[PDB]
């Protein structure tokens, strides 16, 4: 639906939608920008991620409310409406995964872009896994794991331990282990090793980079406090 708008205008409108907290619009604008076929800059990748994370975040929050009501009940209405929200969530995840697969990931050669997109791929398969129950749930989980794992392998080879993308990837992979793969020990070990190796690299950073890295380290510590 965005094929007739200029790439630069779509990006400008994505930023306006963010200021207006119109995240569905923001996602549609960034989808249109991706479909222009050019690679995305660092700032543009962040706009894409912020837009879809907020859209799917609202859907996940709603799904959890409805799933909780449904479990306390077990007419068809609560199940039907949970299924409606669930289907809408799956459609948004499929859209994001389709953008990554056509063709963001295959054109991403630099570590910062490739790790960013593979983290996204793990995240949106993780969101699919949160609602999955049928014959494909194990494959969905392995798809998340495989994307996260490839991102981890690249990040450990190509990025310092304090790199914010590397830290956020490890944070989310640790949540995957704890919440999805039923591997709380793997989750705790990953969060601990990630925190400790970043701590030992903080001395290399500027004041601004220090703030970026320690902010995400605090989320790792918050989870370790919750889990231990």
């Amino acid at each position: 639906a965005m094929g007739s708008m200029e790439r630069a205008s779509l990006i400008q409108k994505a930023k306006l939608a963010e200021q207006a907290e119109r995240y569905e619009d923001m996602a549609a604008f960034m989808k249109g920008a991706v479909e222009k076929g050019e690679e995305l800059s660092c700032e543009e990748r962040n706009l894409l991620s912020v837009a879809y994370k907020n859209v799917v975040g609202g859907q996940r929050a709603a799904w959890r409310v409805l799933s909780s009501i449904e479990q306390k009940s077990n007419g068809p209405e609560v199940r039907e409406y949970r299924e409606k929200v669930e289907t809408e969530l799956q459609g948004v995840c499929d859209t994001v995964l389709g953008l990554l697969d056509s063709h963001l990931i295959k054109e991403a050669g630099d570590a910062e872009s490739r790790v960013f997109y593979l983290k996204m791929k793990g995240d949106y398969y993780r969101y699919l896994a949160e609602v999955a129950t049928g014959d494909d749930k194990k494959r969905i989980i392995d798809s998340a794991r495989s994307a996260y794992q490839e991102a981890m392998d690249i990040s450990k080879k190509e990025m310092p331990p304090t790199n914010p993308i590397r830290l956020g990837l490890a944070l989310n992979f640790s949540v995957f282990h704890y919440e999805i793969a039923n591997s709380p020990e793997e989750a705790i070990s990953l969060a601990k090793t990630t925190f400790d190796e970043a701590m030992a690299d903080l001395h290399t950073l500027s004041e601004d980079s220090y703030k970026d890295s320690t902010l995400i380290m605090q989320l790792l510590r918050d989870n370790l406090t919750l889990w231990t």
Binding site: I216, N223, L226
Partner: peptide
């Protein structure tokens, strides 16, 4: 209940 990455 745990925190994934957020702004």
């Amino acid at each position: 209940r745990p925190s994934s990455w957020r702004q």
